[PDB]
Design a protein around this nucleic acid. Sequence first.
DNA 1: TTATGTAATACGTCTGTAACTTGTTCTTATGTCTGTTATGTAGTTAATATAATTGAAGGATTTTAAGA
Lengths: 1202, 48, 69
Amino acid sequence: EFDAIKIGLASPDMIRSWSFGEVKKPETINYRTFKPERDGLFCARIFGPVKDYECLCGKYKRLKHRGVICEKCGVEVTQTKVRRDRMGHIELASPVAHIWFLKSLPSRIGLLMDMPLRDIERVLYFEMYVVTEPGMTDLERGQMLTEEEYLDRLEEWGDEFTAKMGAEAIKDLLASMDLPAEAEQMREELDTTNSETKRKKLTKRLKLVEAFVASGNKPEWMILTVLPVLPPDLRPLVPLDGGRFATSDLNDLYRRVINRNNRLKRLLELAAPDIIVRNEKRMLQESVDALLDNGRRGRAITGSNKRPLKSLADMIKGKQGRFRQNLLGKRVDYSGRSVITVGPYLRLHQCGLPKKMALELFKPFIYSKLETRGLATTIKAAKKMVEREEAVVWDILDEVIREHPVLLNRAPTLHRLGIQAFEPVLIEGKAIQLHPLVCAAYNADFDGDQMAVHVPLTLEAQLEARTLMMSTNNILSPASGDPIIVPSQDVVLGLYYMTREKINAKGEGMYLTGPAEAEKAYRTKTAELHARVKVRITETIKHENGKLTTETKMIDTTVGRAMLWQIVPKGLPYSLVNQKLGKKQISNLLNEAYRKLGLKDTVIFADQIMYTGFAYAALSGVSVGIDDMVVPAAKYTEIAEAEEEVREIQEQFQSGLVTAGERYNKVIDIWASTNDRVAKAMMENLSSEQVINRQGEQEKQESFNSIYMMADSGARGSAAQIRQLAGMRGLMARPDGSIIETPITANFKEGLNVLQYFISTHGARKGLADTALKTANSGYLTRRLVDVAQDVVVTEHDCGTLEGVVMTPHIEGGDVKVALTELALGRVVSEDILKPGTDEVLIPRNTLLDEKWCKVINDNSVDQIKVRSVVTCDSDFGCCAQCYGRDLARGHLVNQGEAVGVIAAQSIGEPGTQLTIQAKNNGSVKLHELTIIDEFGRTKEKHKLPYLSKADGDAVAAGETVAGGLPRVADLFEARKPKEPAILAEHSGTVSFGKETKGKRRLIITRDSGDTYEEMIPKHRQLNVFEGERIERGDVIADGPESPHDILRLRGIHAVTTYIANEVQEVYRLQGVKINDKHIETIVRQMLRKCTITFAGDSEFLPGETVEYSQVKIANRKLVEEGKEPARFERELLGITKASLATESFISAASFQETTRVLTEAAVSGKRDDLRGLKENVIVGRLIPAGTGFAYHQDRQAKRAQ
Amino acid sequence: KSDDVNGRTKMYKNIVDGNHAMEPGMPESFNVLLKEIRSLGINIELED
Amino acid sequence: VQDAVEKIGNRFDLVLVAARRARQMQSGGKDALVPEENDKPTVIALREIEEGLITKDVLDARERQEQQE
DNA sequence: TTATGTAATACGTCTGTAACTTGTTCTTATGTCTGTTATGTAGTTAATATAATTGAAGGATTTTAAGA
Ligand SMILES: [Mg+2]
Ligand SMILES: [Zn+2]
Ligand SMILES: [Zn+2]
């Protein structure tokens, strides 16, 4: 129907054209008949009939008289909904300035007439005159005259000049401007100017003038002469229960405007003193600005209930505004909500749905089927049968829900796994039964959590639920590629208990034909779960090439291990089961099954694993008791020793040998050591036991303590919690941050006393409040990332670029932080991977590095590779498939139409709550910094070189001595400037000292061309450069934190990409969160979207103008095709907020935040929105140009092409 | 499901008829948005 | 639905093709090419796609044949 | 053999039912005119009196225009 949305100024003729009448009175409704008045705010002649196909006087009261305007009353006989569309207008007695175009800094009016805002308000508030027409007089346009001066110069000259006061004067000045002449004047002066500040001033003014002349708008339209009036049903006056009436504040604001307008019209007939008329004009202006935007001008007007009246800008903007409350999110039908219980009998694709909920949600479907198969003649028959709850209704409900998927959601929806599709199973009850293996994706625990259920209606939605959102498809985490359905808690505990090994268990040394006879022996009480036996195992291996090799052997195992092997699918080695199975082991089992067998086998295996784990955890009988918390006897003696030594050091302090700070520090150290030793003793006592073996001696065995089994299996608990239960609680922190000297020498078994509990509360409160605030901080970060990266969709297959990024293993000392296999798994090769020391092509270009090629690279010892990345792609909009590579959630190449930006934003934002020289290897030494490389050719140590045992190329043996998380990420993504940044060498050249000017110092550099560049350095700066040294570009002059803007300007795109990726991944890896770097690179690509033109060239670009980089690239390609001088640009790093607010679409920018500024700028510039991204199509209800809708939009892009 | 007035009645009728197809239109909230932006004296409109 | 996405290549194109087939079977009078086995039109369309009987090109060819007739 | 006279049988047909249609005649619902009362609007009052008003409050960070 429509392809674009245009925005611009509203002329008085246009506002009159929108209107169906003029509102003349502040009347709303009658106090007896409750009918609208003529010429009021609810007039039926202006806005439409109150009743469908009726008129106020009631003469024409049927559809026979449709479209006939009644002569007695004037009401058109039509539908009532026209009262939601028809507008009105008010003809203002005096012109009024628009508040948005005046007080939204920078002032468009003030910028246009080149006068300060205070001057314009002084004219508007009726304090000073302004000359409109100077005439044949020394006076100039726009110069102020006070009342006295106006009188003297009126006596001096008379009618030669014209001076006015108020909004009328501003209107005449705006209408008298000759925009092209002013534009030429600014162009010439800019051609002959030197100051940079005046350059910026005239650049903005010229941009505004050019925008006005191009958009077709007229400046005088910023002063309103006719005011539009909103349709009544959007500001309703409705009867409430009990006879009370409810109204919108817009009614009060409009009534004030109309009253003051009528009073002004009356005062201009009963000719009145100029002071009174001036005051009334002031009233009219204040009322109009209050109606448009309350609180911007000054004191916000309040109602009879003493809170500010809500204006139109408040309707439009904010968290409660129409964009975010009703357009980007909605309440939906066919939805329900209930508490969630656990269904251990369910399959991965099934969810338990209560019968009453299904009856309510699927009611139209039930009606349809009852009408179709004939038990209901009409729709009220079906409704009555459903209400009476007959049996056949239940069979019909079963048949409708037979294979109709439903969508389950849990708030907060941190990532796309928070909504998934399941096949419903009707259950008796009122609670939704949820499969345990999906809880980790939902972050759902059964302590009162509630879930929402949605019913997809159309066939397309059903097939999207079955194919995309179904639980069996989403088993890999899109953030990292790891399985997200890994078992936890009782499943892990059962698989651990069944796979443990006991000495001298019943049935030891027995020979079993296979897993079946192990099961038979366990069920017949011949052998225990933990008996060491020999079992015949038939094992089939599926190789990388697909070879299936089957072979049988006798293996020394445990009965439980064979019984578990019974459910392991064919194609997997038996070594994966022949061990005690913790959480890591089960995760490895599932990951290997997915890597070597596929998806269906993986889901069946996961279901069987969870069933078996539950069964054998129930059979184990694991329980917690007070005797399971064994307190080591060494704790009391260690506490006594620490206390005695603390007495000794107190004595030393009393002698003056040591100071107070030293005493504090070493007391902290001794208590920390005591805590560590008590924890070690408790672990050693808890983790072992002595048993009698078959031959009769004593043997050491791993303990079967319930708490130890709980901690070691990885089900619940870690060493810290057992330390708190059976060891020592340790040092705790005072609320300011300081650490109290005396620790809590008690655990939770003997219990704390009053003061120990008080110190515990000190930190407990801090933790809870920190979580409460950090949740909101992370949510706001995730929002910001989503709006910056929302437009990134895979739009192509190959972009045909040769650029790429260089990837090497991460080294932050003497050990590798992460191998290159992890960094390269799933990325496409950009430059051919030659074997080191050879010219053979091991890996061709445009190849996806899967597991097998990763193993090849690991075997051939490759250090540095080149791969395509999102930042280096050349696609005009979005990215291509090769530059992104594998999509982690699916395991194959990324498909066309995937919203990679939203995935990246969700992946980064989800873990936000969890957020807060001696050589050690043998090899050679290389100097660049210091690098120690193994004999295989891999760089394994990277060390700094401050301004050495071995020189360059000298071999070094082992041991030789050559000689705050979330705020950081948020600050990094907005590209903040550090408080004290590093001073960096602007240009490559020879350093030289300069005149130490008072206040702060200056330095100079001589370039290769002999030009001298001056630098402004503060006094307190430990300069590193020395005179006579040729420092390269990118060198550090003053040490300190590095600003990403400087890195981009002086080093390049790759440098800033690497910097951002490394720091954010340092923060994430500190807390043990694994996120792939392609998401971060998508965000960084969205940071690099604007360029400032330095050389204007011949293209329609002004110097120093920040424009979009893709537009410049397209223009430069066109100009190169035309053989004309292309533009020279510098690229800018923009923060996620500033990049989001500077999008080409003003709909997305207005829906993000700062709605007033975006709307004002777009209206002045006459912007046009093409609805190219996701948010715009979400607002207008269209299909998003991503995923299933992608093709659709492409078709339109063909139709507009033809 | 939320604010397409004609579309939701059409969807209900189609489901009763066993068709499972929708004819999406313009949400009412967007029309309200346009009306308020126009009430703020700004010409916002749809181009064909 | 791994077999279906393997036969088609893209999940979204598969969803579109299956939706067209399901609408043909439900709104139109077209009959299923595989045993129904008491299944909904969407699942039967998925099964037909997995068996290789239904593709986008096949649907376009059948539409062209219907237009010719 | 042939007139004669009864008897089956098929076809008109006279009359009794019923459909189509109009007269007209009576009854009632509605639209309209008129008279009366309540409602709504408007104008005037003449000791003298001559710069509101009411709150409200532990914010923490960024970015961006004015002033010097
Ligand atoms: Mg919970
Ligand atoms: Zn009427
Ligand atoms: Zn690319």
